[PDB]
RNA sequence: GGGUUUUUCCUUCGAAACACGAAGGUUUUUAUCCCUGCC
RNA sequence: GGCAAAAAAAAA
């Protein structure tokens, strides 16, 4: 039943500003300590800061305070993080941790978030164009063969895509994008699928990058023949 | 004072049913207070141990800490291939808390060959003047595999881009893409453009391709 | 040594790392406190 | 043997 939820990050300008929010659902935070940790791309976690019950005293990482402020409102049941004096280094998905409750689990962290992102950058914001990539029938392909999506020149991360809305999920292969020499972003995703259902059925891609604000659907077809 | 938490190792590989031990080492007195968590590329991390040797309610019996002196490791009894993880090692014992720098858990399965596929450059994307001939590799192991292109026979060098999937959480197999970079006039400039692979699921390299509008 | 009066320290608990609270613990610094009268 | 007195403050 316990949720929290991150959400306030993105993109930044160096030395910019951010204000993280932490939204609680199924447990009170005035009777637990919540904490920021925070992740690197591809490196390991970082303790960041939190604060502790009833005292509402709070503390910090030394990478941080000084430009780094957590707090909560209770009545919110909300958990915030104010970001100032950004710099490339805060670059990182930004999880809130509840610790859990001394006698269940020690000093353990039992619930995250799922992390808000956050991107210092003096780069601007561009929205991916997507291709597809057509399977290959001879007049059909004798069993399964494969179809995808591909996702061109966007920043920043992320992208989230999806094959008929949701509805396919098995056989999906979403590849981690990789940057191109160019400052974008670039990835694809593919799915795999009977040829003897190839032709019956459309295929659908959901991509969508909030930061740019774009959603775009393209629908995959075989050529001619 | 900061404590330093040194987790050994930072990569490892074992099999299903292996037992495999990861190690924290304190840099000074932390008590009990460490905490074990597994974390998904992805998604969050999961408590799994708390107070060092403690099993936080619902993981499975094979995840276990314990604790000598500062010395705290984390051994899973009979790796599965859910396992595939990266864990972390914490240290709650003062502030500001400090985590290992983890390890990252794969599998070893049994070879599998990957199956090839390749596309060629759509042109909505033709349209604005540039090509994305793309190849793929579904659903093999192990990671270790290269891929060739050539342009009418001829061997690329510094226009191609790959990245791979994680490790399944379930069959233990990857899968990759390469994609080239060029130019529209370098596209009607040949002809064919092959993709091949030398993986050790092929017996020598398997290649797949095509021509310019032959659909 | 035995005490009085004050602090700290430690342990379990209170939704509880500090702060606040409840119940506990057996130690030792003071030419920086008292160890005196009455059948 | 039996009653009575007395008396400030720091630390693990």
């Known amino acids: 039943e316990v949720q929290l939820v991150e959400s306030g990050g993105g993109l930044v300008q160096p030395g910019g500003s951010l204000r993280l929010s932490c939204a609680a659902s199924?447990?009170?935070?005035?009777?637990?300590?919540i904490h920021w940790v925070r992740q690197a791309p591809g490196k390991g976690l970082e303790w960041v800061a939190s604060?502790?019950?009833?005292?509402?005293?709070?503390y910090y990482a030394d990478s941080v305070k000084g430009r780094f402020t957590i707090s909560a409102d209770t009545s919110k049941n909300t958990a915030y993080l104010q970001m100032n004096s950004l710099r490339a280094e805060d670059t990182a998905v930004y999880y809130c941790?509840?610790?859990?409750?001394?006698?269940?689990?020690?000093?353990?962290?039992?619930?995250w978030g799922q992390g808000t992102l956050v991107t210092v950058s003096s780069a601007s914001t561009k929205g991916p164009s997507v291709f597809p990539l057509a399977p290959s029938s001879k007049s059909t392909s004798g069993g399964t063969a494969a179809l995808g999506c591909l996702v061109k020149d966007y920043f920043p991360e992320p992208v989230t895509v999806s094959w008929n809305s949701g509805a396919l999920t098995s056989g999906v292969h979403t590849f981690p994008a990789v940057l191109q020499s160019s400052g974008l972003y670039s990835l694809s995703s593919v799915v795999t699928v009977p040829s003897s259902s190839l032709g019956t059925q459309t295929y659908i891609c959901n991509v969508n990058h909030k930061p740019s604000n774009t959603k775009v659907d393209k629908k995959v077809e075989p050529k001619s023949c | 004072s900061d404590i330093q938490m040194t987790q050994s190792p930072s990569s490892l590989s074992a099999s299903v049913g292996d037992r495999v031990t990861i190690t924290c080492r304190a840099s000074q007195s932390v008590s009990s207070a460490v905490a074990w968590y597994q974390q998904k590329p992805g998604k969050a991390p999961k408590l799994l141990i708390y107070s060092a040797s403690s099993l936080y309610s619902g993981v499975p019996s094979r995840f276990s800490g314990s604790r000598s002196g500062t010395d705290f490791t984390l051994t899973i009894s009979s790796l599965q291939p859910e396992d595939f993880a990266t864990y972390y090692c914490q240290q709650s014992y003062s502030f500001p808390s400090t985590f290992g720098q983890g390890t990252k858990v794969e599998i070893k399965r049994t070879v599998a060959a990957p199956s090839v596929f390749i596309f060629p450059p759509s042109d909505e994307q033709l349209k604005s003047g540039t090509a994305s001939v793309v190849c793929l590799l579904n659903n093999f192991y192990p990671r270790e595999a290269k891929v060739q292109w050539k342009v009418d026979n001829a061997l690329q060098s510094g226009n191609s881009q790959e990245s791979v999937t994680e490790q399944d959480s379930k069959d233990s197999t990857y899968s990759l893409s390469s994609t080239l970079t060029l130019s529209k006039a370098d596209y009607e400039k040949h002809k064919v453009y092959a993709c091949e692979v030398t993986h050790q699921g092929l017996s020598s390299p398997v290649t797949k391709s095509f021509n310019r509008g032959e659909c």
């Open positions: 941790a509840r610790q859990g409750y001394r006698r269940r689990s020690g000093r353990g962290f039992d619930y």
């Open positions: 604060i502790s019950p009833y005292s509402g005293s709070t």
């Open positions: 199924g447990f009170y935070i005035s009777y637990s300590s």
